[PDB]
Design a protein around this ligand. Structure first.
Ligand SMILES: Nc1ncnc2c1ncn2[C@@H]1O[C@H](COP(=O)(O)OP(=O)(O)O)[C@@H](O)[C@H]1O
Ligand SMILES: Nc1ncnc2c1ncn2[C@@H]1O[C@H](COP(=O)(O)OP(=O)(O)O)[C@@H](O)[C@H]1O
Ligand SMILES: Nc1ncnc2c1ncn2[C@@H]1O[C@H](COP(=O)(O)OP(=O)(O)O)[C@@H](O)[C@H]1O
Lengths: 326, 326, 326, 319, 326, 326
């Protein structure tokens, strides 16, 4: 009757389907929320600037806040625009003037325009936005999302309360993953759990995206699949490949590299990045880590210029055999 | 010579003549074929993301699926567009805009678009295709081909079923080469065969294009003609050249090189890639292989850095900055 | 009946709320102001050129000169373009053809175009400007802003009344700090005051913007809050990181970088910028200072060109460990 | 009209005095007409500077209205095989002249293109019908022609034309073909041709192929070279300390004109000395331009890189 | 009915018209002449290896030898071939087979095959020659010509009598020239002769070719014409360009270079060779000559790789300005 | 016919005229020659493995072995192949089996196949040789040549009698040179002999060539002719030149190079070869010797690629003084 289990899990993004709906559902940002609640509890708040990584809270809170601030009106008093991609037409001109001119729904004191990826706007775009901002201050309240506050011109920055979102701890990312798992028919094995936490590195959205894609292959989330979904390899394999080289077993490490490459089908950059991570979890004297670190930097730049992936990766492993002889 | 033979033996691409038209006519991608058959046998499939090398199954598996799904109605329900060659993102979100606006043919529930070289798209481009993908999510199903899944933005990957195509085994490649050989009337010499395998190293397409090419020169497939069209020197020659130089006969290694570059007029990268390969077929101590591998990586970069004019030009402008303030 | 404390402070930029609105309200640069009062009480004034540090008197003085020569419409006879934020000497020349186009509002002898950072234009550009300055000379007067009168060409300078502003002392702007800090109800801690001073680097505007942003974070203007909003790290922390590297403590330097990166949430460019500034306050010989300073620029080039941030940033630390040894 | 015939082959000098800028050469050429005696001639230099103009202009004065036969014009870059160069000549310099002088002229355009052996064959052919015909070999560098042919030739080195010379000629074509030669466009055509008269005539035309009005824009547009002002700005930005914006402008240029690393590179080379900076800076830039031209060159010399690598094997070879 | 002198001067190359006919006429190769005379005087002669520069006596000697060995029969019994495959190694070993499979004319005991540029053959080729050499050793006698004996394989070298030709002293060259000047009614000025000798550096052929070229321009041989037809600028001029660049006048040096290039019409390599010849004749400190010699070597190699000449030449001049700042 | 002394000397290469005929003719391997004679005495031998450097006795002895075992029939029973020559050894494998097929001529018990450079065979290649070593062990006997026995697989080593040839010594080489001098009517002087020994440095083949070449100029072998025919300058001269450069006397070095070049007419490479050798005989610290040597190698590469000989020689001498004063 219905579609296949595969399409059922791929249709709607788990990232959205399970985004917390209230400032009390959000996690790991405890201090950030306390500040936000104060707003909703007193119907008073200035323009906001949410700085930090993607998938750690920002837009979840930008929505939750509006929700607890307008109840059933959030959707009629909250304009979500994405500066960068610019979803649609001139999503920064005639669109706003409309929303901005009308009034809030309910006894609401103001509206909210959530400009996501604001730091993607040129200095000029930000100048215009500065005016377009102070223009309807009385009616609209801005919530600017960005990677780095230092990428937003000061005129705009001085009119905002700065919030700095940081990565989330594993436990928190884990609780959410365990929940989505149970409430989806998944058999989240612990190996698969750890495999997701490690890669995700504190980015909730990222962990979810890996969890979902994983489930599409099978309801039993195994680490082997966590790795097949992300262009990732087993952290254990990457280390062996390096140690083998360091120890002096260049040919063998070339062998290992060949396997990881064939099994995972990941890119040179993918391997390089994993290499840069595992190198620091190696029983190697400090001085060798210094040399290793420099080499990874240099080879990363060679890849950027277009150098041959396999040739460069093998030349890097040989460098390891060289740094290993000391 | 061959009067008209060199007109019929090469008028139609043997890759688009002997290309499997049935999922079960595909070799090497077993577990992938299994999954694909399950789609045609349910009428439901989500968006597809095909990751791996070229000429190894990705496009024949797209067509062999359109066939088993649209019967003779494939040429009108299955569209193929190259993400790179195509003018741009817009032209892309355009051609599909008119294709996915009219229902299928033959009662098929949906039509299919095949975006080849999808990772060739910029991030912004992948943002456009993303929206367009969701826009026509009911009428059309997308099959995105890419060299690495890690070069496709997460929003799109979290909506596709991931498939990883690996290189075909030499066995299967030969099985099909003999076939095409018989039905085409060719003296498939044991030599010329091994050549094509050694050069193709897993790439079905590449192996065929070469086979057909050598045939276009002479009905009898000689490893001589293989290397000729293959634009690759004889491994024996490459190894000799490198071995001579290693012995200490630079002057002689250099003549050998000149000859090669003279005969088949290969390229710097051609020779380099062949040298990278043969380093591991030489009778030398591992430590020497370590060095040679490092050196070949280095000259690969020298070649790359040389042909990357923008990187050079910008490094120049930066030199100006350190100068214009001295 | 009142907004929360956070909203009161932010509502208007303190840099304006404490801006000498009149010529006779400026303190510190007396000799200069008096000369400016000669043009207000005479009606006649030539093209001008202000020389001095940022936020030391340049803008506040020019703005005041538009209130005593236009009345309350200091906005309909006073343009404001930034030579460095503008394309070139065309988009700028065009803006002067649309401003001087229509005679000054009311009975106004002429309008005024405050070109900020004029000495940021190339000399071929400073020519076109000199050409444009005169052509409209009649209806519009200019107030070219620069950092050094010497960075302005001859054709220009000879036509301007050179006003030079002296860098306000460090404990000088401190006055206009403890003031506003007490006039706005703030427990401006001594540390924090010093922290603002270190980052302000002689610019009052930046110093005010930092207090306002810091005050919005809490009543007590602390150092932890001056950095968090400034998007910078404690100079001691930067230097300690660089020093820790030079000494060969690579591993420790890494963690310092991680901490800074994690907590303060800085950007690679942010870090690289602070590294380049704290490298000269190092208990190190000048020769190493220049080398290190160039390495920072080398790795930034890599970043500008697409290299991986954490990989390169750490590679840079290793260069430090390596350069320390030599 | 419109574009019936290339201004070049149309407004080409017919007399040795119609030629300008190669005075030392013309004076020597008019000594041949004056005595009716002349040896094999060797013309070396760039294209569009006077070589063929003189070849024709000379043959006209040595044969008069009757010179269309006493002048077999050939082009060395012919069908791979000089076996066609001995039969076509076997009968040309076998048929003595009449009406003209005591000999015939065979203008072999681009003679420095022949291979060693081909040139040695031309040395016997040259000597074969020496009494009948007289050769006029045209080349880029006389150093490409074998000495046995250089010693038998009177050598003339055609230099690039000066601006004043080229300019006026363009004018005497504009004011007779319905054209407006403004100042922005003139200084433009000149700047790009760098003394090449054929080029400055193909640029004047192509730029007028949009309208008689020759604008500095129509000029750079038709041609490849980018706006000197742009290249110059980019460098000043860079020099001024604004690497980011310069990088930006560069992309522009490339994105616009669609040029190569070397074209842009030569253009930079040219404007460096045309910059408001002190001399010492020009020293450092000059050095830096050379360095990067070398990097680009080295990067593309696949033989040198490969042999450098084999030389390295030799090193690694010694255990 | 005569011809203009310019015409009578260019009818036949003087290197030929005046090439010595007898061994006794040959100059500056005393000892060699004697060895060869002993062959004609005894009818006994082995294979020969003539090593040395071009235009100093090798060919003349080979010919003069034939003339004395075969009288008028020298053209019949003496065959010259350019090893530099004036058609291809074999299609040259073929021409020697036809020529060798026949009896000598006039009743002489053997014929001569004079190989020009033997040292231009690869080792494989030189190995084939050694065979052909041994094959007809009884009928033919080979005279192999090379720049350096060390470039000919030992097997061949052992079967030959080595003759090491040297450059000719100026006196020797002067005589010949003044002789030809006498016989051609030219005015060889002291200066013109000094120029010719300077430029020829001992190569008789070269000297005579310059004389001839210059005579074609005027019975009066002036150094102005010598330099002009020899495509070399005068020493004093090259020295000026260097001293100009060396004292700080880079812009001037460039100009001078421009003049030389345009005036005399040299090449990039021509200027470098001249600079190398003249740099040691400058009133400069030894440490500077050391840095300049190193630079000329570096730039020579850049030209060898095909770098742009003007760009490299100006860049080299800039190096003179830098080195110039003691 | 009665040719002059010279023609008689160059009649045939002395290396071949005096090639050791019998095992007692061989010089310098006394112990080995003893084992070899034992085989001829008993008419039987196992497979052999010759190890050591080139031109020191391996082939010579192998041939001398075949001559004594087979007498006049050696050429029929002794086959010599080169392992490294893959293509040829395969396009001749048929001939080999043929040699191994037919019985030994003259009634001898077996034929010998001499595999030169047997250590250029891979592990599998060596495994296969072993197969055919046993296969025909009854009719043919193998003599494998290599640089190191350690490069031949244990299996194959187990089946052979190992012989380790060592370098020859001046004394062995000098005795043979004396024998030839006597058997040719030469006046071998001490200076001449020591000169030869010095130039040949352990190479018997080269030593004989130098002697023959010198005998062709005179019957009295002087150290003057030896250096000349060998195209080498006085070793003291090369050393003095380099020492002069190193002390900082670049100009004197240059003068010396001039004198040398004036006295002989060597090539850039001739000089570099000698420099490369004499640098190791300078009273210099070893690390310097390695620098200088590397440097000569670098400049030889420019020369081989077409650089200007004299310009590079001078640039090289400069590099010496730059290195010295450091
Ligand atoms: N504290 C959190 N609690 C629960 N889910 C979270 C939290 N932070 C992020 N997420 C998840 O990550 C996704 C990314 O949105 P968000 O956190 O606002 O970051 P961004 O600014 O990159 O959009 C959300 O859809 C949500 O599922
Ligand atoms: N020693 C010499 N005596 C007389 N003429 C010489 C001598 N050396 C060179 N020449 C002249 O230089 C020309 C070059 O020929 P030659 O000396 O044989 O050198 P190559 O073998 O390089 O051609 C000859 O035509 C001859 O006129
Ligand atoms: N003892 C010797 N007596 C005479 N000549 C020798 C002797 N040893 C080597 N040679 C010379 O060296 C050449 C090289 O052969 P050989 O010594 O067998 O070494 P390889 O194994 O490298 O071939 C011989 O042809 C011969 O000219």
């Amino acid at each position: 009757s219905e579609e296949i289990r595969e399409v059922k899990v791929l249709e709607k993004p788990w990232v959205e389907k399970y985004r917390p709906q209230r400032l009390d559902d959000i996690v790991g940002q405890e201090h950030i929320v306390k500040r936000l609640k104060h707003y909703v509890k007193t119907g008073s708040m200035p323009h906001l600037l949410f700085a930090g990584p993607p998938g750690v809270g920002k837009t979840t809170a930008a929505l939750a806040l509006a929700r607890e601030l307008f109840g059933e009106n959030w959707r009629h008093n909250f304009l979500e625009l994405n500066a960068s991609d610019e979803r649609g037409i001139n999503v920064i001109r005639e669109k706003v003037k409309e929303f901005a001119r009308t009034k809030p729904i309910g006894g609401a004191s103001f509206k909210i325009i959530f400009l996501d990826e604001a730091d993607a706007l040129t200095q000029d775009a930000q100048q215009a936005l500065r005016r377009t901002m102070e223009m309807f201050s009385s009616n609209v309240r801005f919530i600017l999302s960005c990677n780095y506050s230092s990428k937003i011109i000061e005129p705009i920055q001085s009119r905002c309360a700065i919030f700095r979102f940081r990565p989330l701890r594993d436990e928190d990312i884990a609780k959410r993953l365990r929940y989505i798992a149970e409430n989806e028919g998944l058999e989240l094995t612990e190996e698969g759990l750890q495999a997701i936490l490690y890669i995700a590195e504190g980015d909730m959205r990222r962990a979810i995206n890996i969890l979902q894609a994983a489930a599409a292959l099978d309801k039993k989330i195994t680490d082997e699949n966590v790795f097949m979904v992300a262009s990732r390899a087993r952290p254990e394999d990457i280390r062996e490949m390096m140690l083998l080289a360091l120890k002096g077993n260049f040919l063998k490490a070339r062998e290992k590299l060949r396997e990881i490459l064939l099994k995972q089908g990941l890119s040179g950059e993918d391997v390089l990045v994993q290499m840069h991570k595992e190198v620091f979890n190696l029983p190697i004297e400090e001085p060798k880590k210094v040399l290793l670190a420099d080499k990874i930097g240099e080879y990363n730049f060679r890849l950027v210029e277009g150098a041959n992936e396999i040739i460069q990766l093998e030349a890097l492993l040989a460098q390891f055999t060289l740094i290993g002889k000391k």
